[PDB]
């Protein structure tokens, strides 16, 4: 499903 948002996109 979803994964933890990182510090850069």
């Amino acid at each position: 499903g979803s994964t933890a948002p990182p510090a850069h996109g």
């Epitope: 979803s2 994964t3 933890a4 948002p5 990182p6 510090a7 996109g9």
Partner: antibody
Framework: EVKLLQSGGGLVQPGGSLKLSCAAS????????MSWVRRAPGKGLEWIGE????????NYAPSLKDEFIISRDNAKNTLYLQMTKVRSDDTALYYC?????????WGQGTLVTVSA | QAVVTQESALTTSPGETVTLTCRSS?????????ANWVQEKPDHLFTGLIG???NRVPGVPARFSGSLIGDKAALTITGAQTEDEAIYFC?????????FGSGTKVTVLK
């Protein structure tokens, strides 16, 4: 109740090789970005690299991209960092971080001392 | 190689507001740089505060706010407290890597 346990490190002679481990418990490790940073004595924080949840793309800092190799085993809930052919200025406190809108969860940090 | 710059140190009093800046050498700091702010308290106690310019890691008090002030990224501690006395590091995303700043030694007068 999130804990990142680090192990490895210690004294290493110049030109040696070391491999640090970071075992995550309390989060769905498989779905978390991971990164390695280090704090040298007298220096600031230095970003080593980062690794996707699936290891699709791995990003190292351009300066030290040839010294370190980042890897992970989602099955074991463990993150690894292997430094090969270290130098004297690699002595520092190496920290294991997981991204969550930032450098959310940290490990206790393992000290690596490089000296002949 | 680009260089990230922050104030050498700052000094404030409990209750006041403080603003730390973070300047990129490549040009004006943009939202595409995804500014990050990390805090080191005594005894190598690192705790993340803000990422992606303004998103703060969950569970961090609201007095820490990330923004963009002109050409630099900014971390503003409004209503600072003694517990906020630490070293604040800045990180700027340069397409494929992070570059950490020298760090600002923020002092809150005990």
């Amino acid at each position: 109740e999130v804990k990142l346990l680090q192990s490895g490190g210690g004294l290493v002679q110049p030109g040696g090789s070391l491999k640090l481990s970071c075992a995550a418990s309390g989060i769905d490790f498989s779905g978390y970005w991971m990164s390695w940073v280090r704090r040298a004595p007298g220096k600031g924080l230095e970003w080593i690299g980062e690794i996707t949840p699936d290891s699709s793309t791995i990003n190292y800092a351009p300066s030290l991209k040839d010294e370190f190799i980042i890897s992970r085993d989602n099955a074991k809930n463990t993150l690894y960092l292997q430094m090969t052919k270290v130098r004297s200025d690699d002595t520092a406190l190496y920290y294991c971080v997981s991204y969550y809108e930032g450098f959310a969860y940290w490990g206790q940090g393992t000290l690596v001392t490089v000296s002949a | 190689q680009a260089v990230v710059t922050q104030e050498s140190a700052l000094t404030t009093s409990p209750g006041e507001t403080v603003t730390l800046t973070c300047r990129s050498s490549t040009g004006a700091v943009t939202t595409s740089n995804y500014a990050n702010w990390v805090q080191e308290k005594p005894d190598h106690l690192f705790t993340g505060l803000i990422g992606r310019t303004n998103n703060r890691v969950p569970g961090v008090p609201a007095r820490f706010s990330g923004s963009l002030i002109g050409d630099k990224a900014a971390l503003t501690i409004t209503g600072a407290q003694t517990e906020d006395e630490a070293i604040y590091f800045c990180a700027l995303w340069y397409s494929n890597h992070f570059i950490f700043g020298s760090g600002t030694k923020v002092t809150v007068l005990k």
